[PDB]
Amino acid sequence: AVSGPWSGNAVHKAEKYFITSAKRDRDGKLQIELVPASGRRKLSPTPEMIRRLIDGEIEIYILTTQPDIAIDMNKEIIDMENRYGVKWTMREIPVFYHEGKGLCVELHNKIYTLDQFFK
């Protein structure tokens, strides 16, 4: 099921990972590295670790201050804040698994793919 508050971080209900860099290779494939909230090891989104995401054992997120996020996140973030210190707001986007495309980010009612999303 789920581990207790005492095991790992207490705030987390499932283990938490953050995509920290999204550089590309010579062939243009997106090399995604995600480190856990503790942050002492580097992993890539392999099927075995995606398989955890199907059962909710882990959760993946992206910061909006990432150096290579490709999409102009600050302008859109600034607009929403103005709708309802505005600059320096930072958010965590919850990455989800789409069987057809793999990891997608439902940003502003529009599904995206990590390769489409990142530079």
């Binding site: 207790g4 005492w6 095991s7 207490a10």
Partner: protein, 61 residues
């Protein structure tokens, strides 16, 4: 009057001591949860009390 002054003194103090034992004790339970030693204790005095379901049953009763 003398019998009430001695009996009450050792009772208020006793109650105060019990409250502080739990306080200074939970003051140590915080240090371990933060350092993660909480899951490493083997004593029935901590092991039988790390289940959240068991807590809300004890507190519930």
């Amino acid at each position: 009057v003398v019998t009430n002054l001695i009996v009450f003194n050792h009772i208020i103090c006793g109650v105060l001591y019990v409250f502080a034992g739990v306080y200074h004790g939970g003051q140590y339970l915080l240090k371990i949860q933060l350092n993660g030693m909480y899951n490493q204790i083997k004593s029935i005095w901590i092991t039988k009390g790390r289940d959240q379901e068991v807590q809300v049953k004890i507190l519930g009763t």
